[PDB]
Design a protein around this ligand. Structure first.
Ligand code: MET
Ligand code: CL
Ligand code: CO
Ligand code: CO
Ligand code: NA
Length: 282
């Protein structure tokens, strides 16, 4: 299997005018990074809607992953599901991003752009979908096997899913946020994998990325304590090889320098009065 290189994009996909756009669409930048981390009950309930829709789009696009399918096609499918459900694809026009989801194959860590790239037998394909509806965002991602995937890569996918779920299970009010990355890194190390450091989870709500950072490695110097009504993502990227990476000239696609493959899963979470709720649930 060759290393990937950039392909070419299809034209911007339309969205019905009556689906509300985020404030940033049609601007070079968004207004974000200073929003309260704790959401109102109003916003939380709206985030359940957005999260369900994003989860559905993810699942629909996932079902389409097969050898010979292009990553643009996956984007068409995600896009159409969002629009059929009255949601806007948050990534479309975000910081100029040209598509409605991110599609990251093999050595791509994250933020791949859907394009002419053809899925080859044996690939692993992350699809990352964010829905904006009712003035709020819901963000989820999963890595899917395409055709006859090697056991090594099947296990990498399955263990990254399980790392993510284990971390989710530790979310609790009154507990340090740092527990999340402790758990992920412990589980990744169990199976000799390496957790990506420079890319993190994030607070999300009325804005796509607020100032809250969720580390996916063990960093106990973080003092933040989880509180009820906080909303954020857990989205670890887990590598078979070294952490070193490059960013392509598109400014988005992040790739391992050694070209070994890497998997990711993501949910949007709520800290409740006593525990957690996965908002991006089918
Ligand atoms: C083009 S922005 C993609 C952002 C991504 N969905 C995230 O989880 O942050
Ligand atoms: Cl890193
Ligand atoms: Co995402
Ligand atoms: Co995210
Ligand atoms: Na990857």
């Amino acid at each position: 299997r060759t290393a990937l290189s950039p392909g070419v994009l299809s034209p911007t996909r339309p969205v019905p005018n009556w689906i509300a756009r985020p404030e940033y669409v049609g601007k070079p930048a968004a207004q974000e990074g200073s929003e309260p981390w704790v959401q109102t009950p109003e916003v939380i309930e709206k985030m359940r809607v957005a999260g369900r829709i994003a989860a559905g789009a993810l699942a629909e696009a996932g079902k389409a992953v097969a050898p010979g399918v292009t990553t643009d096609e996956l984007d068409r499918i995600a896009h159409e599901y969002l629009v059929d459900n009255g949601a806007y694809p948050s990534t479309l026009g975000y910081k100029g991003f040209p598509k409605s989801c991110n599609t990251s194959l093999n050595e791509v860590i994250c933020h791949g752009i859907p394009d002419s790239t053809v899925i080859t037998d044996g690939d692993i394909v992350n699809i990352d979908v964010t829905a904006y509806i009712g003035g709020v965002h819901g963000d989820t991602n999963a890595t899917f096997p395409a055709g006859d995937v090697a056991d090594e890569h099947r296990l990498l996918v399955d263990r990254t899913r399980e790392a993510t779920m284990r971390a989710i299970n530790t979310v609790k009010p009154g507990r340090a946020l740092s527990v999340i990355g402790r758990v992920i890194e412990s589980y990744a190390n169990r199976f000799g994998y390496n957790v990506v450091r420079d890319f993190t989870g994030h607070g999300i709500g009325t804005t796509f990325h607020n100032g809250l950072v969720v580390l996916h490695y063990d960093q106990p110097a973080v003092e933040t304590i989880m509180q009820p009504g906080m909303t954020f993502t857990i989205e670890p990227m887990i590598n078979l090889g070294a952490l070193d990476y490059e960013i392509w000239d598109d400014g988005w696609t992040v790739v391992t320098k050694d070209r070994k493959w890497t998997a990711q899963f993501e949910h949007t979470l709520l800290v409740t009065d006593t525990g957690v709720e996965i908002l991006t649930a089918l």
